[PDB]
Amino acid sequence: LTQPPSASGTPGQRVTISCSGSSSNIGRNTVNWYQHLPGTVPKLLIYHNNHRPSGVPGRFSGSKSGTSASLAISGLQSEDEADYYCETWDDSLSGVVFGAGTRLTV
Amino acid sequence: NLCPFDEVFNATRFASVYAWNRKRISNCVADYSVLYNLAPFFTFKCYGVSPTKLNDLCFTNVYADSFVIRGDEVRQIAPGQTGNIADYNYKLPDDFTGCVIAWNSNKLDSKVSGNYNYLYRLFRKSNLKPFERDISTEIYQAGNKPCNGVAGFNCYFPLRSYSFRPTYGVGHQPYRVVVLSFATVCG
Amino acid sequence: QITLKESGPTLVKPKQTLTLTCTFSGFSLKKNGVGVGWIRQPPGKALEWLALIYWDDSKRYNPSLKTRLTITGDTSKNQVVLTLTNVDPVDTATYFCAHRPDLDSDLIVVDAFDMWGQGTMVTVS
Ligand SMILES: *[C@@H]1O[C@H](CO)[C@@H](O[C@@H]2O[C@H](CO)[C@@H](O)[C@H](O)[C@H]2NC(C)=O)[C@H](O)[C@H]1NC(C)=O
């Protein structure tokens, strides 16, 4: 796929994350998101789109505008100094294609 | 006496979402004691009824539905949930009070070219009255000039066909979906 | 209550066959609609996905790695076993067996890893 390497933000403003790829996977299938602190285990943060499991703040939401997956950060604070990953199943590549990672500073 | 659920869950072929096949179960006892005894491997979802009281209940009717849909479409088959597939292929009523089972079939519903034999209706003049099976295959218009059959600019054969190649995502894979909808039958 | 427990050798010389494993708990792979993953972690680089075992032995690999990755899951032994050969120092990583459902009990497709293993710091030297 395609993902910018990093993003920045003061603790609290509306911070945008972007992701992109081709029409086979992100333009057709559904998008995922993850939060990974450095050195520890990652965890799911948004599945299919815009919907979260138990244990996720509801302020962070996505959008599938064709080939774009757009995670959002509003209300930044200390804990989420972490690498943010977009994945999607690919139809042609027949597998799971991750993003490039994006670390958000507080 | 064993009512047939061994063909509502083991049949080789179903039909599409526009041609959802019914099974009218009556006059019989169906051995429920294996269908939830199968570590519900199939994805199992009951509304109002509970998995611990199938044996000890009785009904006027058990209509047993069956249709095949793409992976992300199993959100639709529940009361209150809206969108294209409910609006155009299968509407459930809000006070439906049965149990829904679905399971994945990349086996038997997928070649490497994918089976194009499974259809779905995009379009119709109105949203469905619930539980109305629609085998209607006329040529849909929604514009100022409804012509006879000249395709192009909203003159479609609305029953387009899915593709189900097994390289697809799980949200696109073909799901084998059965609604157990609901004066004799007990346990 | 779902837990991915993984194990295997980590002090491995380069270029022979590394076999790893992960014993999954809290569910079964006899369930259908369920995959179990394997995830690369080059430290400070990215994550890459290796493979999925599906319940009917449906076989997926990363298109970078076809021949060096073949995969098996023994549901009877309640574990999935990862096999890989001719192993480079770039393959020094931490590997994650992780759980990939599609249930989401109000029935929305997940297609994602919701529960993960802790990881094994695999070393190639
Ligand atoms: C579909 O057919 C299979 C093949 O026989 C049935 O599976 C067996 O069913 C018997 C009778 O219930 C059980 O004792 C076995 O343990 C089952 N074996 C396996 C591997 O599942 C299955 O029950 C049939 N489906 C339905 C709905 O009857």
Side-chain angles (χ1 to χ4, degrees):
Chain A
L1 321 173
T2 287
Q3 182 182 10
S6 286
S8 174
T10 60
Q13 90 263 16
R14 179 55 144 79
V15 176
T16 187
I17 307 313
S18 45
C19 175
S20 88
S22 59
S23 71
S24 82
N25 43 9
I26 190 167
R28 185 139 161 271
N29 277 102
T30 63
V31 298
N32 304 4
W33 292 97
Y34 294 94
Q35 181 153 297
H36 163 259
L37 294 174
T40 69
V41 64
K43 64 91 175 179
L44 188 154
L45 198 154
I46 304 96
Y47 62 90
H48 160 79
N49 203 51
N50 267 328
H51 218 302
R52 57 200 54 85
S54 295
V56 176
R59 40 191 190 170
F60 309 144
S61 288
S63 69
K64 267 195 279 284
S65 177
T67 176
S68 75
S70 189
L71 189 140
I73 301 299
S74 197
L76 183 63
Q77 63 284 60
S78 86
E79 69 275 16
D80 62 357
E81 304 168 355
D83 292 331
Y84 292 162
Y85 280 36
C86 49
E87 81 193 336
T88 300
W89 186 271
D90 189 274
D91 284 325
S92 56
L93 278 296
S94 87
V96 177
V97 194
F98 271 75
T102 291
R103 204 211 311 121
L104 182 62
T105 49
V106 58
Chain B
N1 184 220
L2 292 170
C3 314
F5 289 151
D6 46 350
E7 292 83 4
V8 77
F9 305 131
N10 273 0
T12 311
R13 174 205 60 249
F14 300 166
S16 291
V17 70
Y18 85 113
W20 46 277
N21 280 10
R22 181 73 81 189
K23 197 48 175 297
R24 204 173 78 165
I25 300 300
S26 295
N27 304 111
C28 165
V29 75
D31 211 334
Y32 289 3
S33 310
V34 299
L35 61 83
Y36 52 93
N37 189 78
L38 39 90
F41 292 144
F42 321 122
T43 305
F44 183 76
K45 180 174 181 56
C46 300
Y47 281 22
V49 301
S50 87
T52 61
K53 63 151 198 291
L54 281 71
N55 286 108
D56 61 357
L57 180 60
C58 305
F59 279 94
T60 81
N61 51 325
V62 176
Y63 293 71
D65 268 12
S66 285
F67 43 71
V68 172
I69 61 171
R70 152 164 172 267
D72 53 356
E73 318 192 308
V74 310
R75 184 280 321 300
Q76 274 303 9
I77 299 314
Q81 314 300 20
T82 186
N84 204 57
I85 298 168
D87 278 343
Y88 284 111
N89 302 271
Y90 189 94
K91 213 53 190 163
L92 273 178
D94 217 339
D95 62 358
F96 154 72
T97 301
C99 191
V100 189
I101 190 167
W103 66 86
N104 189 359
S105 161
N106 273 348
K107 307 292 182 66
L108 294 174
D109 291 331
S110 187
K111 292 159 299 310
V112 76
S113 63
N115 204 2
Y116 288 80
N117 207 5
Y118 294 87
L119 281 53
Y120 70 108
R121 176 189 315 206
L122 283 72
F123 270 115
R124 208 173 68 91
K125 65 178 72 66
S126 72
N127 291 350
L128 272 295
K129 180 68 174 66
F131 267 123
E132 195 165 12
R133 155 184 292 138
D134 209 10
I135 303 299
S136 62
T137 50
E138 73 264 42
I139 297 309
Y140 173 77
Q141 315 306 136
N144 51 1
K145 294 181 176 67
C147 67
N148 167 52
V150 178
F153 314 126
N154 182 260
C155 302
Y156 314 139
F157 182 76
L159 274 297
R160 213 159 309 142
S161 169
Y162 290 129
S163 179
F164 282 133
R165 313 182 259 101
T167 61
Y168 280 156
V170 160
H172 271 259
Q173 274 151 24
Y175 262 119
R176 193 75 66 86
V177 189
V178 175
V179 191
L180 288 184
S181 45
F182 290 98
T184 79
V185 297
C186 306
Chain C
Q1 56 156 73
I2 48 175
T3 302
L4 277 296
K5 175 34 181 73
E6 61 274 4
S7 66
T10 54
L11 294 174
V12 175
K13 273 294 154 186
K15 300 289 94 176
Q16 53 273 70
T17 296
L18 182 63
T19 301
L20 294 174
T21 180
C22 168
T23 66
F24 59 98
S25 302
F27 73 111
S28 66
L29 190 150
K30 281 296 198 59
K31 183 73 176 177
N32 63 7
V34 61
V36 165
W38 281 107
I39 297 89
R40 297 292 299 274
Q41 182 43 290
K45 182 67 180 294
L47 294 174
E48 293 83 3
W49 157 85
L50 294 174
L52 299 191
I53 282 281
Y54 282 179
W55 60 90
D56 48 336
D57 208 28
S58 300
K59 186 183 287 185
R60 298 299 191 277
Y61 299 110
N62 186 326
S64 58
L65 276 300
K66 299 288 94 175
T67 187
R68 307 185 53 263
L69 276 296
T70 179
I71 193 66
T72 317
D74 273 28
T75 315
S76 65
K77 278 208 272 294
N78 206 24
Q79 63 214 20
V80 64
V81 293
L82 171 83
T83 81
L84 58 87
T85 67
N86 296 115
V87 181
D88 202 80
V90 66
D91 213 22
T92 292
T94 64
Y95 290 167
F96 291 158
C97 64
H99 179 198
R100 187 188 193 74
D102 51 46
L103 277 79
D104 189 359
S105 182
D106 71 348
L107 259 56
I108 293 91
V109 56
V110 182
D111 214 333
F113 313 81
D114 62 357
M115 198 87 206
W116 294 63
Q118 273 303 9
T120 60
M121 60 181 180
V122 60
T123 69
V124 179
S125 176

